[PDB]
Amino acid sequence: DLKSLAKRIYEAYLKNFNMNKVKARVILSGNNPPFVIHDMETLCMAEKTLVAKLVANGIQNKEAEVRIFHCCQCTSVETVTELTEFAKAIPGFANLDLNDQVTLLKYGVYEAIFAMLSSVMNKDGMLVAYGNGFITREFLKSLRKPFCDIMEPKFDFAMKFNALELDDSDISLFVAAIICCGDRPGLLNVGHIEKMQEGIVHVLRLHLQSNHPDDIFLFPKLLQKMADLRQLVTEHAQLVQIIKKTESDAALHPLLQEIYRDMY
Ligand SMILES: CCCCCCCC/C=C\CCCCCCCC(=O)O
């Protein structure tokens, strides 16, 4: 039954996420090749094709860094929708009280986002806009403060995460395990969530044993990555709060504002 459950989770991941690691690698390797964004000229060209409404405002267009942050938020909002549907495949999740489902997704979505971002990142840049753009790591570092500080820790995480050489069958189970953490603040049926966590982590552990016979510590490596992601999210939320307080034009989408509210 555990092998079947691993396959169910993998299939739910392939169905519900618009991007997966095979699809990303095909694009990153070289009919609609990605438009490369490496400077302000190519950002503005890319926007006019890929997000035309955002730059259709003349001198009322927002600052480039704020437009970029807006596009970052749109990607998060979409990934939150995909993760919410994916979670239905996790045994026990749909049997939880609605409020506990909300809490698990609230704390888990950005850990899952940054884990899955690794699949579209290499040391030079990342895919964006449903695989139709590639924005360089150096360009994002070139942005004015504080916006240059958003992505670099995520690239740092991803380079090490990618060196583990996971595939989508592994990542799907890892994302399921992120969602099933019984120590999230405010949970009301901790006991049932802990059993749900134990079950998915057992599936993950057996799958990694089978799929990565060469790396006998891969399961504890991934437990550590889960803790590293929690710290990355706490730090990310702190930076978002700086942006919120100090950048009046960088409006936060209400769904993400609710995720961040009372989080850490
Ligand atoms: C014209 C395309 C412009 C693309 C800009 C870069 C898009 C980056 C893609 C995904 C960003 C992932 C990080 C999201 C965290 C910041 C936003 C948030 O807190 O939700």
Swiss-Prot record:
Effect after changing residue 218 to R: No effect on heterodimerization with RXRA nor on DNA binding and transactivation activity
Tissue-wise expression: Skeletal muscle, liver, heart and kidney. Expressed in monocytes.
Keyword Aminoacyl-tRNA synthetase: no
Family: Belongs to the nuclear hormone receptor family. NR1 subfamily.
Superkingdom of this protein's organism: Eukaryota
Processing after translation: Ubiquitinated by E3 ubiquitin-protein ligase HUWE1; leading to proteasomal degradation. Phosphorylated.
Role played: Ligand-activated transcription factor. Key regulator of lipid metabolism. Activated by the endogenous ligand 1-palmitoyl-2-oleoyl-sn-glycerol-3-phosphocholine (16:0/18:1-GPC). Activated by oleylethanolamide, a naturally occurring lipid that regulates satiety. Receptor for peroxisome proliferators such as hypolipidemic drugs and fatty acids. Regulates the peroxisomal beta-oxidation pathway of fatty acids. Functions as a transcription activator for the ACOX1 and P450 genes. Transactivation activity requires heterodimerization with RXRA and is antagonized by NR2C2.
UniProt-annotated location(s): Nucleus
Organism listed in the record: Homo sapiens (Human)
Protein name in UniProt: Peroxisome proliferator-activated receptor alpha
Residues binding indeglitazar: 76, 110, 260
SUBUNIT field: Heterodimer; with RXRA. This heterodimerization is required for DNA binding and transactivation activity. Interacts with NCOA3 coactivator. Interacts with CITED2; the interaction stimulates its transcriptional activity. Also interacts with PPARBP in vitro. Interacts with AKAP13, LPIN1, PRDM16 and coactivator NCOA6. Interacts with ASXL1 and ASXL2. Interacts with PER2. Interacts with SIRT1; the interaction seems to be modulated by NAD(+) levels. Interacts with CRY1 and CRY2.
Gene: PPARA
Keywords: Activator, Biological rhythms, DNA-binding, Lipid-binding, Metal-binding, Nucleus, Receptor, Transcription, Transcription regulation, Ubl conjugation, Zinc, Zinc-finger
S-S bridge residues: none
GO biological process terms on file: behavioral response to nicotine; cell differentiation; cellular response to fructose stimulus; cellular response to starvation; circadian regulation of gene expression; enamel mineralization; epidermis development; fatty acid metabolic process
